[PDB]
């Protein structure tokens with residue numbers, strides 16, 4: 134055959150959560166490389182367990198960027214709630230690791246819902262991943278979020294069926310992508 | 323049974339016209355295309371006029387009165403929303419009858435002029451009417467640049483066809499890849515008559531030569547090793563006209579033409595001049611040399627002499643295409 | 652179990668123009684056709700690892716359309732692995748040029764390289780994914796994010812080592828890097 138076999142499949146109605154350490158390059162620039170990894174392993178191990186409880190499938194860790202999706206592998210109509218509950222658990226977890234370790238770790242959380250393409254790429258070192266405009270947007274919501282709070286889109290609010298009290302996010306004034314694409318954001322209480 | 327056909331070729335080769343013929347043949351909006359037709363008219367007249375003073379040597383007007391009409395056309399050239407007053411058509415028609423303007427037109431291969439130039443300028447009195455209705459042939463000549471990919475769906479004897487149209491200009495070629503996977507066959511279109519012209523993208527590369535390089539890239543592509551190519555040697559009507567006119571020699575652009583004699587398997591049309599037969603078969607062979615050099619058994623090339631604007635020639639050739647696709651593909 | 656290292660050369664290689672090329676329409680199957688092309692590119696890159704001259708290169712992962720790799724993970728003559736990484740970057744450029752020739756595109760690579768101590772291992776409870784951490788890795792990523800098309804940007808210390816090996820370098824200047832402040836960087840010559 135002409136092209137290599139592609140191991141990717143499309144999935145509608147899913148939710149993507151992104152979490153990122155604030156000022157990571159600054160943080161890792163201070164303490165030893167040993168201490169940093171202990172702080173991260175302590176943090177991401179808990180997240181990985183909370184992911185199983187909240188029905189979320191973790192994707193990967195990009196140093197300080199943690200992200201997962203809900204509604205995979207098997208479709209779930211309860212998706213958006215899982216990611217919100219998952220983000221909630223993360224914020225408390227970061228708080229404990231801030232307490233028992235003493236390190237100033239703070240994360241921003243962004244969430245969005247839509248369609249994704251998931252699978253693997255290349256021939257070597259396969260690592261399950263997701264790609265799509267919706268995944269790209271979800272990523273920007275994190276960049277445009279606020280320290281220690283969950284930032285969601287209007288598309289994610291419509292899947293939440295009104296179970297969470299939110300306030301105007303104003304994500305448009307903290308990230309040029311969200312503004313340019315006219316996205317209404319919200320912050321969960 | 324669903325066949326996905328991908329149209330490829332350089333810019334202004336005839337891809338969008340082929341799609342139009344499928345719509346007329348195998349598948350109201352005419353009022354919307356009137357504006358596009360008047361634009362083609364305005365573009366043709368202003369281009370021929372703007373070139374008069376830049377040629378070497380320059381072409382002079384045969385009538386001094388027309389100097390004012392030239393001044394008129396140039397003053398409205400860049401006007402965004404032109405309302406097309408009755409005066410405009412009077413000036414264009416006047417200019418197109420001037421022998422000097424006509425001489426500049428005979429040297430159009432020296433600048434960039436759209437193919438529908440003479441067709442529309444010859445019927446200004448028809449287009450100018452407020453009650454004017456575009457004929458089938460008018461919509462086939464109307465030129466509008468293609469940007470992006472367009473899918474047209476039709477059915478012939480309960481057999482499905484999905485045809486993809488793509489921009490042929492250089493910057494547009496980067497989109498083709500999105501149609502490579504699972505393509506039934508490729509239809510490569512070429513402007514057989516553009517041997518004495520240069521492309522628009524740089525104003526230096528010979529048009530036919532660009533097609534040849536583009537075909538070689540397609541035929542030898544790593545993702546199309548088992549994909550057959552139906553080759554449309556388009557613009558047969560302009561080729562014959564150019565060949566017979568004797569002003570622009572083929573061997574002065576492609577030296578190899580001087581060592582070329584017509585093949586045995588040659589099947590000339592009834593009444594066709596030997597010179598025309600010799601030229602069209604030469605252009606086919608330059609393309610066959612490339613297809614012959616590689617692939618060997620994995621995929622084949624099927625040539626066809628065509629004239630996109632001639633609905634009759636297209637029905638005949640697309641039928642021959644239906645035969646090729648079913649015999650194996 | 653984790654492990655500490657002293658001199659690992661990390662490289663981040665991006666394709667800045669890819670994001671623009673990617674589009675979701677009904678014709679390209681909601682962006683699936685674009686992803687197919689990314690698959691070909693990552694695959695052509697992946698097989699350079701089979702070349703004997705590249706035995707010491709370890710692919711770490713792909714970040715979107717960015718390729719991440721490292722050398723010196725086989726350790727623990729002294730500095731040749733840093734030079735092998737630069738040779739690997741040149742190879743990728745040749746793989747991407749081949750891709751452009753067939754897909755009618757003009758993608759260009761943007762590279763960032765640095766070296767120093769790192770930590771290798773797995774992290775988290777979900778899966779056994781090998782990765783590397785450290786300030787060395789963070790800086791390498793910045794040498795990419797603040798780089799130039801068709802250029803390999805390296806740090807001052809990496810520049811010195813490349814010179815003892817026979818490479819020429821041009822000073823890019825002093826740029827204020829997010830989280831690090833003012834850093835003096837360099838471009839490898841060709």
Ligand SMILES: Nc1nc2c(ncn2[C@@H]2O[C@H](COP(=O)(O)OP(=O)(O)OP(O)(O)=S)[C@@H](O)[C@H]2O)c(=O)[nH]1
Nearest residue numbers: 333334335336337338339463465468490557629630
């Ligand atoms: N006389 C004549 N004119 C033709 C023929 N085929 C196409 N044309 C004219 O040439 C012009 C260009 O053809 P068109 O189909 O628009 O090109 P294209 O290949 O789609 O071009 P592009 O979109 O890549 S930039 C049109 O005005 C069309 O009517 C032909 O066989 N004979």
Ligand SMILES: C=C[C@@]1(C)CC(=O)[C@]2(O)[C@@]3(C)[C@@H](O)CCC(C)(C)[C@@H]3[C@H](O)[C@H](OC(C)=O)[C@@]2(C)O1
Nearest residue numbers: 263264265266268269272670673714715716717
């Ligand atoms: C394939 C292209 C496209 C558009 C697909 C996509 O969703 C991404 O892969 C994400 C968002 C997505 O895969 C999630 C991980 C990460 C690392 C955040 C990606 C990068 O930002 C990619 O862009 C870069 C900059 O490499 C981006 C945006 O590229």
Ligand SMILES: Nc1ncnc2c1ncn2[C@H]1C[C@H](OP(=O)(O)O)[C@@H](CO)O1
Nearest residue numbers: 157158195196197198782783788789792
């Ligand atoms: N192992 C790694 N894998 C991927 N990205 C990494 C790794 N280590 C560091 N980075 C990224 C994280 C930072 O980007 P952000 O996540 O902060 O956007 C950047 C500089 O620290 O390098």
Ligand SMILES: [Cl-]
Nearest residue numbers: 332335513533
């Ligand atoms: Cl052509």
Ligand SMILES: [Mg+2]
Nearest residue numbers: 154155156157
């Ligand atoms: Mg960060």
Ligand SMILES: [Mg+2]
Nearest residue numbers: 337338467468
């Ligand atoms: Mg067209």
